Amino acid sequence: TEELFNEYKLTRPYMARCIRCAVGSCHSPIAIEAVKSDGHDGYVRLQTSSQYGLKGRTMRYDMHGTIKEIPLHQVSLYTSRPCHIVDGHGYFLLARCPAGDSITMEFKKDSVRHSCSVPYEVKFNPVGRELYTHPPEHGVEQACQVYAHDAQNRGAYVEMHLPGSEVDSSLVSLSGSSVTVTPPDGTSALVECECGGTKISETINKTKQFSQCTKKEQCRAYRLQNDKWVYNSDKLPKAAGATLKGKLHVPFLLADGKCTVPLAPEPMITFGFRSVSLKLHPKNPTYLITRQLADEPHYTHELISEPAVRNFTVTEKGWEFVWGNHPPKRFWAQETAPGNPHGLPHEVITHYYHRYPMSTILGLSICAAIATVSVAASTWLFCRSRVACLTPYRLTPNARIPFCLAVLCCAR
């Protein structure tokens, strides 16, 4: 597996600025660049300044120009509760973390504790329609997307450039009355001082004494790096010349996996006339998605977390609920109205009213109106004919009524 590790064998670690580094702010060797957390079951992929895996499980950090290392099992990090490092490759660590507001990666080399806290949100993303914080002991397996544990060449690349001129106060020094620049072993440097005129000079492994500039602060001593890379970071000065010099592919990309999702307790389903009731006892919070199987779906979507009772309406056109990670159960209504359709006319009205509510009211209203108009009109014509019978017989001064027209028209 050297074929994909030697690319990060040609870079370096570096130091960069952190905000919270266990007392105030400082330059920390474990400065966190980015925390991408889009895998599902809690897998995050940090990018730091120190490198990893360079030897089996170790981390390789800069320390004031010189490069050290510790075993990886003395590095710890935590978001809100502690995390567990899985592996690392180059600048990138892979961890497993709960959710939190920040990340503090820390170790302790001597009795001197190194830390770095950055305010980057870590989020835990569940799979499925049922929202958990720690994945269950058992369930069913759905398609999920987590960061792949291996380190293979894929589409993504990050770019590493030349390092800038790192300055060094320790490199400048004093003679009896002089200023001496002592580069480290086998190392070139460039020196810039501004005490007399203007001086830009370069040394190559030569401890040079300057006769003028009789203060330490008059001179700035930089350091030269030529065979190494650093990441294109905003926390490092850039070198002269616009050469980017190359790029490397990242480990731990996101891939397609399989994750065990929990399974809700089954509901208790009670039926009514054109109705289905649901008694729901979730363990953890659980979405309930229902819709009708007709032209207007009237869908409903609700995150249920406590015990609930959800009375729905089911017509003869269908109904469908999804509860948790369970499949959709479909229900269909059939014609059971309250009443007897075969007699006792106060029962057939209630049967055809619970069957068809609007049409029964409309039909009984128009039939009662037709019957009312017919009875009123027939009574009107009866009174008209009784007046027309008895009008000629009452205007006569004899005032008599014959035998047939008396009783048949109630004349008396």
Binding site: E2, E3, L4, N6, E7, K9, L10, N153, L162, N226, D227, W229, T243, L244, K245, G246, K247, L248
Partner: protein, 50 residues
């Protein structure tokens, strides 16, 4: 096939003239101009090991 460069001389990107463990300072200059090149991946893989 892809032809990478180090000067005005084309060579196949699977057979580099130099390696990192032989000359470390010049492989970065070799990977300088070869970024806008479809065979940067093969050039880096060939510059990984000898």
């Amino acid at each position: 096939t892809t032809m990478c460069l180090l000067a005005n001389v084309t060579f196949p990107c699977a057979q580099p003239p130099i390696c990192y463990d032989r000359k470390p300072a010049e492989t970065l200059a070799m990977l300088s101009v070869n970024v806008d090149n479809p065979g940067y991946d093969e050039l880096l893989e060939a510059a990984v090991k000898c």
